[PDB]
Amino acid sequence: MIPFKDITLADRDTITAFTMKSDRRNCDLSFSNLCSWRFLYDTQFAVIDDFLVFKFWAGEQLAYMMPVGNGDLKAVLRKLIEDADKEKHNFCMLGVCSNMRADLEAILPERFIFTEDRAYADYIYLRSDLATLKGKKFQAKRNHINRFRNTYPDYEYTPITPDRIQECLDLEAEWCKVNNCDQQEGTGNERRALIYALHNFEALGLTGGILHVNGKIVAFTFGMPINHETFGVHVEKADTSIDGAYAMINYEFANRIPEQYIYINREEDLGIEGLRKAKLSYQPVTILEKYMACLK
Amino acid sequence: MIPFKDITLADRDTITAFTMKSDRRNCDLSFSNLCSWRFLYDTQFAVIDDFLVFKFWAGEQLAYMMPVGNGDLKAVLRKLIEDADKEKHNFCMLGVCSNMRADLEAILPERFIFTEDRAYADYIYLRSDLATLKGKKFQAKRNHINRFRNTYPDYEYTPITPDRIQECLDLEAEWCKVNNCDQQEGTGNERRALIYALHNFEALGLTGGILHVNGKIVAFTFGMPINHETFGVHVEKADTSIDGAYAMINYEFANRIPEQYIYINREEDLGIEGLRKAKLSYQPVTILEKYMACLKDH
Numbered sequence: 001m002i003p004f005k006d007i008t009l010a011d012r013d014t015i016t017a018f019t020m021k022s023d024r025r026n027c028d029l030s031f032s033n034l035c036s037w038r039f040l041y042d043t044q045f046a047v048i049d050d051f052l053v054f055k056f057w058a059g060e061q062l063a064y065m066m067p068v069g070n071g072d073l074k075a076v077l078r079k080l081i082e083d084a085d086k087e088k089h090n091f092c093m094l095g096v097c098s099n100m101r102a103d104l105e106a107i108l109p110e111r112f113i114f115t116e117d118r119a120y121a122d123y124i125y126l127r128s129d130l131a132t133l134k135g136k137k138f139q140a141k142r143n144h145i146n147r148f149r150n151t152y153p154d155y156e157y158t159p160i161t162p163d164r165i166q167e168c169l170d171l172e173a174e175w176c177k178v179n180n181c182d183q184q185e186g187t188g189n190e191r192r193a194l195i196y197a198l199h200n201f202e203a204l205g206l207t208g209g210i211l212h213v214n215g216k217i218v219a220f221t222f223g224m225p226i227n228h229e230t231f232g233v234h235v236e237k238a239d240t241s242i243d244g245a246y247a248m249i250n251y252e253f254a255n256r257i258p259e260q261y262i263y264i265n266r267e268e269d270l271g272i273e274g275l276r277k278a279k280l281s282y283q284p285v286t287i288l289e290k291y292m293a294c295l296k
Numbered sequence: 297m298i299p300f301k302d303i304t305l306a307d308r309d310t311i312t313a314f315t316m317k318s319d320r321r322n323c324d325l326s327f328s329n330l331c332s333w334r335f336l337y338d339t340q341f342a343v344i345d346d347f348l349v350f351k352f353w354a355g356e357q358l359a360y361m362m363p364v365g366n367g368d369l370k371a372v373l374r375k376l377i378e379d380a381d382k383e384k385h386n387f388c389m390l391g392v393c394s395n396m397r398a399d400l401e402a403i404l405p406e407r408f409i410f411t412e413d414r415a416y417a418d419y420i421y422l423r424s425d426l427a428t429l430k431g432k433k434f435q436a437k438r439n440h441i442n443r444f445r446n447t448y449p450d451y452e453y454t455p456i457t458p459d460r461i462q463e464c465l466d467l468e469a470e471w472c473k474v475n476n477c478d479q480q481e482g483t484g485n486e487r488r489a490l491i492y493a494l495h496n497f498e499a500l501g502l503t504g505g506i507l508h509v510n511g512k513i514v515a516f517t518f519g520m521p522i523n524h525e526t527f528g529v530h531v532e533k534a535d536t537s538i539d540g541a542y543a544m545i546n547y548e549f550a551n552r553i554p555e556q557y558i559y560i561n562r563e564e565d566l567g568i569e570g571l572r573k574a575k576l577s578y579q580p581v582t583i584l585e586k587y588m589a590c591l592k593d594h
């Protein structure tokens with residue numbers, strides 16, 4: 001029996017030892033994302049034949065993350081299929097990128113059914129693009145930040161520190177309530193994941209920023225590295241009454257992301273029309289498809 | 297500076313080393329309950345100053361359990377208050393039993409406000425009563441068992457084994473369809489805890505039983521020790537169209553609980569009138585009240 005263990009804060013070194021050196025850019029491999037969503041998926045992990053593997057329960061559905069590492073993929077797949085068999089479920093893997101799909105097909109030709117939903121693709125950008133907003137592609141973004149600067153000349157950006165967390169939580173609840181975000185699917189779950197992240201901010205290895213206008217917090221954002229060259233921005237929330245607050249905090253935080261992080265992953269659009277429009281407006285270099293791969 | 301960590305399956309030995317030797321009987325100290333409800337409370341623990349301490353987020357309420365162990369209680373409480381200060385919340389402790397409340401008032405007189413909610417009291421029974429149903433006060437219970445045996449003379453009770461986990465999950469799915477766990481907050485939350493327990497049954501240290509009638513599962517139950525002399529029954533579910541199934545599974549499983557567990561803790565009524573009458577009807581020896589102790593100012 002694979003000795004799957006519940007993921008915890010204390011597993012940060014073990015997990016990032018695999019992910020940081022990997023070529024995997026999927027935001028679901030962020031240590032903060034894995035821990036913060038454990039309440040929903042009863043998330044577990046194991047290291048099997050030099051691969052890091054995650055196991056998730058989503059109601060009736062059992063799924064495993066595409067194994068992270070190098071080594072004998074066939075051997076690890078045999079063990080995961082046996083694990084699914086023990087659970088009396090068909091074997092399904094999530095987070096399979098295009099390269100991973102090719103690797104699976106090579107081991108078990110015709111055995112996997114691959115399904116993809118563009119709602120779940122990640123948007124990846126150049127840090128240099130988001131931090132500088134240089135070039136014609138970013139002209140409107142420059143206009144937004146210049147307009148913000150003109151409207152709110154006394155704004156203040158500060159990094160998130162443990163001392164600033166509870167206010168971020170209180171404010172997030174207030175903003176949601178204004179937009180009646182109760183009545184939007186999934187916001188309760190998103191709130192649980194936000195709370196865990198902010199409560200355990202330092203242990204997780206998150207960094208983040210807060211925007212203030214006229215002496216009050218009006219936006220906050222946080223994230224952490226996904227791999228050696230990709231930083232994930234996991235959350236970005238703002239007081240919707242403040243025009244340009246999203247654009248401004250994006251820009252300020254991008255400039256605090258260490259320069260080794262070539263890429264910034266700002267996650268998925270969830271098939272929401274307005275969100276897809278917003279994420280495409282920042283000119284992603286890659287839209288990172290994620291397949292589910294289920295044994296036939 | 298308290299190195300709180302998320303509770304996990306792997307922490308079984310660490311936790312139970314403290315709880316088994318303790319005189320704490322409340323069901324919240326079952327290792328299975330601690331892990332299985334983590335999804336709701338983001339539960340963490342630490343050993344500090346020779347005590348085992350737990351930290352929970354009950355929605356907006358930060359809470360700690362009464363420290364488990366022996367040592368300088370005042371020193372450890374000071375550390376927990378400082379932790380609450382860092383969280384920017386008042387310090388409040390849960391599961392303070394009547395005896396633990398007396399201990400607190402001795403070391404720190406008039407420092408705490410104590411509140412109690414009868415909905416959260418645990419029902420504690422003698423294993424000897426539930427396993428035998430002997431005497432006048434258990435006559436109705438014997439009658440239900442006897443009716444069951446007469447109606448279903450070829451029923452089969454089995455322990456929960458790995459190959460039988462799926463039928464328990466199947467019964468739970470049917471029960472939740474009937475009871476609307478998808479929308480009922482309480483039973484939706486119970487479903488999350490029950491399913492975690494079943495999926496991790498052996499790692500947690502749980503034991504359980506299953507009742508079958510006419511070839512299908514009609515009830516299951518599971519639990520594990522809380523301390524050296526108290527066994528906790530965490531879950532009991534039955535197909536409602538089968539009369540006497542709750543009585544029979546209770547009786548069969550009580551007989552499987554090892555004799556060193558003098559007491560059986562069958563948990564709370566949650567202020568639900570039906571559940572309260574059911575739990576009172578089995579004649580508890582103790583209704584274990586649980587206080588919340590909140591620091592008056594600071």
Ligand SMILES: CC(C)(COP(=O)(O)OP(=O)(O)OC[C@H]1O[C@@H](n2cnc3c(N)ncnc32)[C@H](O)[C@@H]1OP(=O)(O)O)[C@H](O)C(=O)NCCC(=O)NCCS
Nearest residue numbers: 471475482483486532533534535536542566568569570571
């Ligand atoms: C609606 C009504 C039927 C609710 O009672 P009910 O669902 O029949 O009875 P309960 O909720 O006690 O029991 C339902 C089941 O869920 C269980 N249950 C309820 N809450 C639970 C919880 N938090 N955890 C685990 N089990 C729970 C009970 O044990 C019971 O199990 P069983 O059916 O397998 O024996 C009620 O009897 C009634 O009177 N109807 C109208 C009520 C009304 O108008 N209300 C005014 C309120 S002010």
